[PDB]
Amino acid sequence: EEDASQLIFPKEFETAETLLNSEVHMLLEHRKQQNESAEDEQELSEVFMKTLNYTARFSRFKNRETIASVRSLLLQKKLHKFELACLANLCPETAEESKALIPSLEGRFEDEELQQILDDIQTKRS
Amino acid sequence: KRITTPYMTKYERARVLGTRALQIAMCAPVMVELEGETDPLLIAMKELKARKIPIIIRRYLPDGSYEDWGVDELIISD
Amino acid sequence: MFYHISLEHEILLHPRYFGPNLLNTVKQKLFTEVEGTCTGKYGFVIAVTTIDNIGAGVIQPGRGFVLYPVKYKAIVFRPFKGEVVDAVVTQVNKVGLFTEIGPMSCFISRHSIPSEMEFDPNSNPPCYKTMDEDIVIQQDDEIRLKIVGTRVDKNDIFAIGSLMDDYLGLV
Amino acid sequence: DKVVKRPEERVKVGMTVHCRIMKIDIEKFSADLTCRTSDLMIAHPSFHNINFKQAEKMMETMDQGDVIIRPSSKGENHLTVTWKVSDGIYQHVDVRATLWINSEEFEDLDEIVARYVQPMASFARDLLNHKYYQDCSGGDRKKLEELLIKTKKEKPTFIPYFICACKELPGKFLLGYQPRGKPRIEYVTVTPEGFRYRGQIFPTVNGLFRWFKDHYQDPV
Amino acid sequence: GATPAYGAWSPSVGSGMTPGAAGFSPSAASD
Numbered sequence A: 001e002e003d004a005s006q007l008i009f010p011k012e013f014e015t016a017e018t019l020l021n022s023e024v025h026m027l028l029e030h031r032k033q034q035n036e037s038a039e040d041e042q043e044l045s046e047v048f049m050k051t052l053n054y055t056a057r058f059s060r061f062k063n064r065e066t067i068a069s070v071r072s073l074l075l076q077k078k079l080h081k082f083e084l085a086c087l088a089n090l091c092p093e094t095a096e097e098s099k100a101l102i103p104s105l106e107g108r109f110e111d112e113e114l115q116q117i118l119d120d121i122q123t124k125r126s
Numbered sequence B: 001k002r003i004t005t006p007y008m009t010k011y012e013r014a015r016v017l018g019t020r021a022l023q024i025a026m027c028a029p030v031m032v033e034l035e036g037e038t039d040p041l042l043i044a045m046k047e048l049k050a051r052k053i054p055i056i057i058r059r060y061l062p063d064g065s066y067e068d069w070g071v072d073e074l075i076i077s078d
Numbered sequence C: 001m002f003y004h005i006s007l008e009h010e011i012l013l014h015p016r017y018f019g020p021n022l023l024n025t026v027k028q029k030l031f032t033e034v035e036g037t038c039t040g041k042y043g044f045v046i047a048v049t050t051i052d053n054i055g056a057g058v059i060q061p062g063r064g065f066v067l068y069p070v071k072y073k074a075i076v077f078r079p080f081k082g083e084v085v086d087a088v089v090t091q092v093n094k095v096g097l098f099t100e101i102g103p104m105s106c107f108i109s110r111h112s113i114p115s116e117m118e119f120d121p122n123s124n125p126p127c128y129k130t131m132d133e134d135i136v137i138q139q140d141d142e143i144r145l146k147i148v149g150t151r152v153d154k155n156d157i158f159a160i161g162s163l164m165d166d167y168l169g170l171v
Numbered sequence D: 001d002k003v004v005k006r007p008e009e010r011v012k013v014g015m016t017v018h019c020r021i022m023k024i025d026i027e028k029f030s031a032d033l034t035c036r037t038s039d040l041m042i043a044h045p046s047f048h049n050i051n052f053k054q055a056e057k058m059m060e061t062m063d064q065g066d067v068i069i070r071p072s073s074k075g076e077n078h079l080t081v082t083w084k085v086s087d088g089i090y091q092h093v094d095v096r097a098t099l100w101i102n103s104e105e106f107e108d109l110d111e112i113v114a115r116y117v118q119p120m121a122s123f124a125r126d127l128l129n130h131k132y133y134q135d136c137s138g139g140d141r142k143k144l145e146e147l148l149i150k151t152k153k154e155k156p157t158f159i160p161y162f163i164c165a166c167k168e169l170p171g172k173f174l175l176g177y178q179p180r181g182k183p184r185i186e187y188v189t190v191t192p193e194g195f196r197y198r199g200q201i202f203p204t205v206n207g208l209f210r211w212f213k214d215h216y217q218d219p220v
Numbered sequence E: 001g002a003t004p005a006y007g008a009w010s011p012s013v014g015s016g017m018t019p020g021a022a023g024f025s026p027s028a029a030s031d
Helices: A020-038 A046-058 A064-075 A081-091 A095-101 A111-124 B009-026 B040-050 C021-031 D110-117 D118-128 D143-152 D205-212
Strands: B056-060 B066-070 C002-013 C042-052 C066-077 C084-092 C098-101 C107-109 C142-146 D067-071 D079-084 D090-097 D162-165 D174-180 D182-184 D187-190
Touching: A020 A046, A020 A064, A046 C042, A046 C084, A046 D118, A064 A081, A081 A095, A081 C084, A111 D067, B009 B040, B040 D174, C002 C042, C021 C042, C021 C066, C066 D067, C107 D162, D079 D110, D079 D118, D110 D118, D118 D187, D118 D205, D143 D174, D143 D182
Parallel strands: none
Antiparallel strands: B056 B066, C002 C066, C042 C066, C084 C098, C084 C142, C098 C107, D067 D079, D079 D090, D162 D174, D174 D182, D174 D187
């Protein structure tokens, strides 16, 4: 029954806080910067290393202000939290591609209304 | 706004001494200079006399509320 | 998908650790207790960002161990079905394609792959191309996919991908 | 060993002895294994890679200001800093004198002393050159009291003062005076930044004296 | 250990009464 396509999740996960690829990347980078210092400390694990190199290959933008601006311009809409991560991460070129990838957008908003947002996101990309 | 008695009941004193003795016997740091004794119960008694036991008692009331007292806060009976 | 939620956990602390660094030791144990693990309820946890507070350690009766119900603000990664993500292809085999969704690895079958993407066993690097050889897909490529199934192998998530929907390849 | 007892210490009889192999004679039933172990192959901060009783034997030679860092003898990952205070008086700062510090300082120990011992050492030495200074065999409580009553008689009008440092509790100076025919004692602590007299902390050493010479007139 | 904390002791101040007159020496300049 758990299918993100139809916007259904467990109660505990419903109240979660979405994260973006750049957001998690900078969080992990700062954690690594803090941990590397303060000698006599248990070093990072392969999980941390793999997650770091996995998120580093999809950092659409390095500027925390870029992250802030995109989330601020996005939250003003009526879309659910789940729509804030996938759409902000994939950065599709056209509204048709976005609608095809995410079935939720089908009929939820106008074509130009979504296309302008997609163009804004692409532009915001560094 | 604590209304429980400001004296340590014999029950609480006994239990505190016992628990501190067990902790010491489990190689825990002491809170008083040792004059050359080894018995954990004796060390616990000395700490109780010196009012340095790092333990706080939580007295529950019939209603459901509770009050946290520090061993170094309330008066010791014996 | 990565998320930032507040979790709770309790740890017993052996009395040998009592001292001026009690809180520090509790934090260290929490770090090296709830990092990298996985659970079927909240999913796979990456790391811990910060700690909310330290509860009141309740010394057990007749035992020196004292438990601290600490609540920590950490992040978690619990992919769900139907979500679309961008992974990197790790290996190409006639049996299937192997990718790496961060802390998780999926796998797609040739049946999921359309008929247009044939095999290239003759070429040294295992790769799939079309008749016109215009589009090329190989390893170390940011290829997208859709999570159509999930699985937890005793705290080891291993989902399954798919390549049927259009617009799944090079951006 | 050739014409003497067979080599027993060099080669383990019955057991296996480790030695450097300098010959490959497996096929020839030879083993050129060497039985010998060799075959197989002012402000002078010192260091110490020691106990407490034996350490005191090497503290009375250095002059004032020579600081020495040694391990601790209470727990683990602890250090004790000892700086020369006076003749026989030594403060053993047991760093967990609960001096709270971080862990990054462990890598470089060239600033802990220069930040909390050097100024404190200078302040302590400032009192050593004081005009009215004495030791009285380590400054014992039984010997420092008779001096006040023996010195008041020669000058009942003028009430002089003295300063000394105790031996059983290093780092606590005794500043006594005789308001009347009854002795009184007042301790004082020397903090890293300065002193701690009546709860106040002064920036300079002379500040304590200047503030003390204007507050002992009260009846108390 | 045989070397407990020495700087952690709280210096207790002694109390008393001495109704004396003001006839002691003056102060000095801090320079």
